[PDB]
Amino acid sequence: SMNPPPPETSNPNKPKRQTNQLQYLLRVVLKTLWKHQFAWPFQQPVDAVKLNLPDYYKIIKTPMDMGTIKKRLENNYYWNAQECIQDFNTMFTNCYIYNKPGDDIVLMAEALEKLFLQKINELPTEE
Numbered sequence: 048s049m050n051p052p053p054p055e056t057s058n059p060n061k062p063k064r065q066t067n068q069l070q071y072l073l074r075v076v077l078k079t080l081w082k083h084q085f086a087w088p089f090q091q092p093v094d095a096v097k098l099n100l101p102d103y104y105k106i107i108k109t110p111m112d113m114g115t116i117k118k119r120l121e122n123n124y125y126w127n128a129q130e131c132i133q134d135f136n137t138m139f140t141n142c143y144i145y146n147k148p149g150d151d152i153v154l155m156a157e158a159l160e161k162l163f164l165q166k167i168n169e170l171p172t173e174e
């Protein structure tokens with residue numbers, strides 16, 4: 048069994064910038080979710096080998112995790128807030144696509160996703 052390579056977190060070909068909205072995504076949004084008691088499954092890519100999930104990367108073709116998002120934000124990988132918000136959404140959606148309603152991991156993602164929506168609701172206007 049093998050895991051795919053993780054999503055990239057550095058690419059000199061990719062346009063990027065800092066924006067006050069990206070700063071909020073790191074300092075408020077990512078920091079809030081990262082410290083949550085249910086963050087830990089989401090702090091790195093799914094290890095389909097150790098977890099014995101050989102079908103994971105057949106069903107989830109756009110993997111994403113908060114370890115990758117945190118690196119992307121600390122490395123200033125994004126051009127805009129929407130790119131980063133779409134990474135969070137891909138992470139939650141992947142969890143709901145692979146798992147069953149009411150599974151623990153789905154309750155975990157729902158708790159993180161509730162906080163994420165409450166914080167993104169107050170994304171600042173772009174300076």
Ligand SMILES: COC(=O)C[C@@H]1N=C(c2ccc(Cl)cc2)c2c(sc(C)c2C)-n2c(C)nnc21
Nearest residue numbers: 087088089093094098100142145146151152155
């Ligand atoms: C049988 O299905 C699973 O094991 C799916 C797996 N559940 C789990 C999981 C995580 C937490 C609990 Cl309480 C139960 C299952 C999982 C991860 S990553 C990781 C380190 C684990 C242990 N996960 C994510 C993220 N998305 N799906 C999963």
